[PDB]
Amino acid sequence: SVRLTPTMMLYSGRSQDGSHLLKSGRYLQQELPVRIAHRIKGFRSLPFIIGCNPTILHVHELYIRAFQKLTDFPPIKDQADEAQYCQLVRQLLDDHKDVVTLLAEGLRESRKHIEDEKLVRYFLDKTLTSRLGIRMLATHHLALHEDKPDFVGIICTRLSPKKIIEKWVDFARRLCEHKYGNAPRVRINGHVAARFPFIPMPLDYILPELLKNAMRATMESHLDTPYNVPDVVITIANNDVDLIIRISDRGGGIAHKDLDRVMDYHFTTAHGFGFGLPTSRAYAEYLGGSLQLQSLQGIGTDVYLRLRHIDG
Amino acid sequence: SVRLTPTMMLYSGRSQDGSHLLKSGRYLQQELPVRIAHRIKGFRSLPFIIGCNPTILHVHELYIRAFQKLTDFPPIKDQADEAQYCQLVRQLLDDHKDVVTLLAEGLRESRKHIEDEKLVRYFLDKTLTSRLGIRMLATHHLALHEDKPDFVGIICTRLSPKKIIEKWVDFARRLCEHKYGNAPRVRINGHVAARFPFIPMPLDYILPELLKNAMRATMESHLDTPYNVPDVVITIANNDVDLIIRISDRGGGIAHKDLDRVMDYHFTTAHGFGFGLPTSRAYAEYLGGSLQLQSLQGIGTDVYLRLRHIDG
Numbered sequence: 001s002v003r004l005t006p007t008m009m010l011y012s013g014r015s016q017d018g019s020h021l022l023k024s025g026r027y028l029q030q031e032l033p034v035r036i037a038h039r040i041k042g043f044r045s046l047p048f049i050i051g052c053n054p055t056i057l058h059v060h061e062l063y064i065r066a067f068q069k070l071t072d073f074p075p076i077k078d079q080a081d082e083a084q085y086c087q088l089v090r091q092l093l094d095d096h097k098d099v100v101t102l103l104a105e106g107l108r109e110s111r112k113h114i115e116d117e118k119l120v121r122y123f124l125d126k127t128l129t130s131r132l133g134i135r136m137l138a139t140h141h142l143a144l145h146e147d148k149p150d151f152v153g154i155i156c157t158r159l160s161p162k163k164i165i166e167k168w169v170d171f172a173r174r175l176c177e178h179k180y181g182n183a184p185r186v187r188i189n190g191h192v193a194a195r196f197p198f199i200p201m202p203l204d205y206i207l208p209e210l211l212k213n214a215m216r217a218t219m220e221s222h223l224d225t226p227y228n229v230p231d232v233v234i235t236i237a238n239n240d241v242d243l244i245i246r247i248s249d250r251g252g253g254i255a256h257k258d259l260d261r262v263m264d265y266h267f268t269t270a271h272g273f274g275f276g277l278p279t280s281r282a283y284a285e286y287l288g289g290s291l292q293l294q295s296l297q298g299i300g301t302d303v304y305l306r307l308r309h310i311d312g
Numbered sequence: 313s314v315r316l317t318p319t320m321m322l323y324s325g326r327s328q329d330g331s332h333l334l335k336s337g338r339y340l341q342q343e344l345p346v347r348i349a350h351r352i353k354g355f356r357s358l359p360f361i362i363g364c365n366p367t368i369l370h371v372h373e374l375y376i377r378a379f380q381k382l383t384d385f386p387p388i389k390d391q392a393d394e395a396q397y398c399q400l401v402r403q404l405l406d407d408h409k410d411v412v413t414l415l416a417e418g419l420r421e422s423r424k425h426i427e428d429e430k431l432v433r434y435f436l437d438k439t440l441t442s443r444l445g446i447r448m449l450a451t452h453h454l455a456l457h458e459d460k461p462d463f464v465g466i467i468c469t470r471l472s473p474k475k476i477i478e479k480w481v482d483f484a485r486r487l488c489e490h491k492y493g494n495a496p497r498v499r500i501n502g503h504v505a506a507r508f509p510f511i512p513m514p515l516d517y518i519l520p521e522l523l524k525n526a527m528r529a530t531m532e533s534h535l536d537t538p539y540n541v542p543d544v545v546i547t548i549a550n551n552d553v554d555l556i557i558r559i560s561d562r563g564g565g566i567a568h569k570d571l572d573r574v575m576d577y578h579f580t581t582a583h584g585f586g587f588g589l590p591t592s593r594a595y596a597e598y599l600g601g602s603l604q605l606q607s608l609q610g611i612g613t614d615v616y617l618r619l620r621h622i623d624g
């Protein structure tokens with residue numbers, strides 16, 4: 001039993017013997033090295049000047065190491081194997097946890113050099129999303145060893161969009177109060193009672209990115225009245241095709257002169273790395289959804305996150 | 313006074329004082345470093361795996377050296393400067409004389425690795441033609457120091473297509489007799505008496521390449537009667553727009569299965585490097601002409617070289 005992801009499946013299975021764990025493990029063992037190989041080919045095809053960057057080189061090496069360890073691992077025959085594969089997966093997850101940051105820093109300068117601006121976008125888009133895919137499958141396998149209720153692996157059986165939004169609201173508010181002394185309140189409307197099966201992992205990246213953006217913009221446009229700023233309003237629309245989360249702020253909007261730039265990696269007006277929007281959009285599209293911006297210059301911004309529903 | 317080349321001009325000038333030599337020299341001094349820089353940017357943007365190839369790296373270094381020496385050279389103020397610049401130009405010409413071969417060998421293997429097949433074509437096309445441009449301008453400057461009659465620099469004032477074809481016929485025949493014991497005869501028809509101003513340099517590359525192809529094909533398809541093979545027939549058409557040289561052989565033609573490949577760098581059915589056709593076409597197009605093939609599978613091949621006339 002499965003839940004389709006692009007070109008991949010999140011194994012849904014329940015054998016008491018623990019058989020499903022072996023099927024999963026063998027799947028990963030079949031799937032991971034291939035995808036890592038594609039990422040290594042991506043590094044090999046980078047413009048020479050960029051690929052030679054020490055940080056890019058470092059990540060490049062990590063990916064080779066990862067491929068080495070994965071391929072060196074013996075075919076899984078029993079729980080004892082699988083149990084040990086999990087140790088490797090965990091080590092890999094941890095070794096690669098800073099990869100986005102390293103890529104950002106590695107490319108920040110090196111990218112100025114080449115003529116082809118969209119080449120880096122293509123590379124980052126492809127790399128970050130393949131990576132998300134890899135870490136999802138990996139994390140899902142590990143999660144099958146857990147006995148969390150309302151979870152089949154990383155899949156929440158009854159996810160509440162409101163609850164997960166509130167989780168990331170509290171988080172983003174704190175960051176914001178720390179830097180500004182206050183934070184916009186956030187109201188949530190629409191299908192606030194919706195519950196459905198869903199993988200929270202993408203939400204856990206995207207939502208805090210969008211919230212940080214909205215809060216920062218609200219504060220930086222109300223520097224005279226930090227004690228009194230307009231709410232951020234979030235609207236949940238749940239239908240049979242997709243989930244829509246609209247995040248509306250009164251933070252003055254995105255300027256016409258920045259509009260063409262904000263979806264570029266490394267672009268920022270400063271929370272300062274410039275990856276939030278491009279990464280979030282790439283993630284959404286990778287999962288079959290989208291991320292769209294509506295700027296009302298001089299008033300604020302509406303951001304629309306759409307994510308497809310799990311088939312089944 | 314000038315003769316236009318793409319984005320560049322072949323200085324036509326005649327001062328007795330030797331003033332025109334300074335204008336030329338200063339032009340080169342202005343023009344060469346820029347074009348070398350573009351080629352260096354081309355090397356920097358090569359796929360990392362290819363750019364790391366030791367031979368590619370070597371050529372890459374040559375180009376940097378070339379840029380260093382050119383930029384380090386002091387602005388030209390007098391004949392004594394110019395005279396010394398010429399020494400540098402000559403050294404560069406000679407240091408870079410094997411560059412095409414080095415690139416061919418450097419890429420032969422490295423190119424298999426990347427996904428994008430047309431990326432190397434674009435690189436070679438751009439590099440080889442920029443290089444041709446550079447060596448033409450350079451050689452032209454040096455040639456302005458000569459007192460050859462019917463030559464203004466590298467420009468023959470009264471070039472005879474028949475004479476230059478015959479030059480390369482004798483050359484290609486010898487190569488061919490050496491390898492096979494005989495060589496097709498060659499007949500030349502059409503405007504055999506034409507004479508007009510023209511830069512022979514491109515002809516000196518293209519013609520021997522096309523002739524070698526035609527002769528090899530004729531022999532390899534007449535292995536039973538090497539002592540008696542069908543002529544190669546060359547037709548000259550001279551009009552006001554362009555010069556057309558048609559090289560028809562009865563060498564059995566280019567097979568349908570090879571047709572899509574023959575214009576690819578490194579493709580060969582063996583005179584064995586696989587650069588003749590792609591280089592020749594790139595050269596022709598760079599100069600505003602073209603190179604077109606008509607295959608009659610089972611009979612032979614017609615090759616059409618078109619080169620624009622010098623405006624003025």
Ligand SMILES: Nc1ncnc2c1ncn2[C@@H]1O[C@H](COP(=O)(O)OP(=O)(O)O)[C@@H](O)[C@H]1O
Nearest residue numbers: 213214217262268269271272273274276277301
């Ligand atoms: N809700 C918003 N309101 C106003 N401006 C925004 C909003 N979201 C993003 N921006 C602008 O787009 C830029 C890119 O955002 P992002 O990709 O998250 O990078 P960062 O937040 O690190 O600057 C921000 O620097 C900011 O100028």
Ligand SMILES: Nc1ncnc2c1ncn2[C@@H]1O[C@H](COP(=O)(O)OP(=O)(O)O)[C@@H](O)[C@H]1O
Nearest residue numbers: 525526529574580581583584585586588589613
């Ligand atoms: N006149 C011709 N007749 C038949 N085949 C030809 C002719 N010219 C070229 N070819 C084919 O096209 C291929 C590519 O030619 P070229 O680029 O000159 O490389 P090379 O001669 O080094 O093989 C040759 O290997 C040969 O198969």
Ligand SMILES: O=C(O)CCCc1ccccc1
Nearest residue numbers: 032092093096099131134138
């Ligand atoms: O996270 C990344 O940067 C890419 C994936 C590293 C990894 C491989 C296999 C399993 C788990 C993690």
Ligand SMILES: O=C(O)CCCc1ccccc1
Nearest residue numbers: 344404405408411443446450
């Ligand atoms: O020939 C090449 O490979 C490229 C040109 C080297 C050169 C530079 C300046 C002048 C003369 C020659």
Ligand SMILES: [K+]
Nearest residue numbers: 262264267274
């Ligand atoms: K950005």
Ligand SMILES: [K+]
Nearest residue numbers: 574576579586
């Ligand atoms: K070829």
Ligand SMILES: [Mg+2]
Nearest residue numbers: 212213271276
């Ligand atoms: Mg941000």
Ligand SMILES: [Mg+2]
Nearest residue numbers: 524525583588
């Ligand atoms: Mg040839």
